[model samples]
Target: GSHMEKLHQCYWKSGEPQSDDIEASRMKRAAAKHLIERYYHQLTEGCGNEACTNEFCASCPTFLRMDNNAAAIKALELYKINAKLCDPHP
Candidate 1:
């Protein structure tokens, strides 16, 4: 696995980091986690519906929805892209 996000995870997982620097390796996970919270959600938890309950994609809000909704898909992509750009080895 690439080691870039790993470092960011260390700084991000435990505390609310206070910094004034613009460093990707240090802020990637924190930033990603923040966006994921807002963007990765359905109309409600375990959304019981066809469109939001599709079981064929990682981009779906499966556990959250019990799906292929737009918000869910966006959350998935956000994390994936975060890993790519928020790293040292990317």
Candidate 2:
């Protein structure tokens, strides 16, 4: 579950991801962990928020969704976003 969802090309859809495409984030296995961790840390207050969601959460509320996910959200955030806690899949 610590893996970065292969959505590297995903756009925030902020204005218009399809047309606007503000920024196309390209991250490797390690780079992805950092962003994933970032989204989790914001949950310091509540369970689910836009900041609490990311490619990892996928709006599933983590393990709370019965998938063995982290409740703290930031539970995945670490100084070194590494594959040490990523998925074995690509």
Candidate 3:
């Protein structure tokens, strides 16, 4: 959930939707806990606005935490034009 959902292409994606949904093969069992802990830390503190939503300063966890999946996912593309102006997704 955490790693695969990122806006950037740090990982890979399959051409098929159903095939892309399969993530077990790409995940490391031991890395799960560590990644979650790091995510919590980013939420509690901040991502320094570097890894925040759309890599913007205003859309950071320090200011607010976006919980919904739909908008948060869409905002990645929507915020490119006006990073700070982003509130809702496209």
Candidate 4:
């Protein structure tokens, strides 16, 4: 039997510092959702399929996992560096 990979939450939100304001949290959530949506659209041409345009299987072992892996890592890193200009933490 194949061993299952350990699941990590990634916590892109954890990269964000906590905020106490409700409005700020709402805005942050909205912005995160927007960026995620844009990324999804670009990835799947707005379709819900996890498959990339290259016809690779979304669940294939060789395939890269989605949901804030590399892309999210980069985004959060940049956000951390530029938190001053970005929305408050969610």
Candidate 5:
């Protein structure tokens, strides 16, 4: 398997249920990280002024899903700097 190519559980019983709750949050965070990374990388590296269109920005749905909108916005700032393309924000 490639280094980056290779890639969780429940709450029950009389236990405090902390493990699964925390683990669930961890899983959510990991998923969010993957989504944001994919988006940021694509925006910064994959698209060009002429290559990307308005619909391309529309395809990034993570901002709506993101709990912290600023995080997505911050990532977009880097993409704007790197790609020199202004993207419409929600």
Candidate 6:
């Protein structure tokens, strides 16, 4: 049991690449294999689940109530605020 546990711990620890330089290291390792084709197939084929087939309605109600002029002004204000907070220089 101790040997099995130690082996499992080593397997998990070996997955971690130890280094001190943050800027020099890549944040995430590249995948050993690509899964893009499988992901696209799943998306296009409905994920074979009822929940996956439905569009999310969280923001739809709020979006539909706003008229063009109000919507344009609101969108511009949000864009400006988002850009300021999200951009590297800001």
For each candidate, how many residue pairs have backbone atoms clashing (under 3 Å)? Answer: 1, 3, 0, 0, 0, 0
lDDT tens digits by residue: candidate 1, 1-90: 653434433343535555544255555545556645544543223233434444322333443422446646556565655421211111
Error of 3 at 71 (Å): 19
The candidate maximizing TM-score is 3
Better of 3 and 4 by lDDT: 3
lDDT of each candidate versus the true structure: 0.42, 0.37, 0.40, 0.37, 0.42, 0.27
Give the per-residue lDDT digits (tens) of candidate 5, residues 1-90: 432232223432425736434644555545544455655545444333343443334234333222235446755454333332334333
The runs of at least 3 residues in candidate 4 whose Cα sits more than 4 Å from the true structure, single-residue gaps closed, are 1-19, 45-61, 64-90
Question: On a 0 to 100 scale, what is the lDDT of residue 40 in model 1?
Answer: 50
lDDT for predicted candidate 3 compared with the true structure: 0.40
Using Cα atoms with residue i matched to residue i, what is each candidate's TM-score against the true structure? 0.27, 0.22, 0.31, 0.24, 0.28, 0.23
- Residues 1-90, candidate 6: write the lDDT tens digits: 231111111232434664443322222212101223222222233233333322211123222223444443443444323211111111
> lDDT (0-100) at residue 73 of candidate 2?
37
* lDDT per residue as tens, model 2, 45-74: 223343343334434344322133453433
How well does candidate 5 match the true structure, expressed as C-alpha RMSD? 11.5
Model 3 spans with C-alpha error above 4 angstroms: 1-27, 54-63, 66-90
lDDT of 3 by residue, 11-84 (tens): 45555554443465346433544444444343333443444554332347434554444334434433333233
Model 4: lDDT to the true structure: 0.37
Q: How does model 3 score by TM-score? A: 0.31
User: What are the clashing pairs of model 5?
Assistant: none
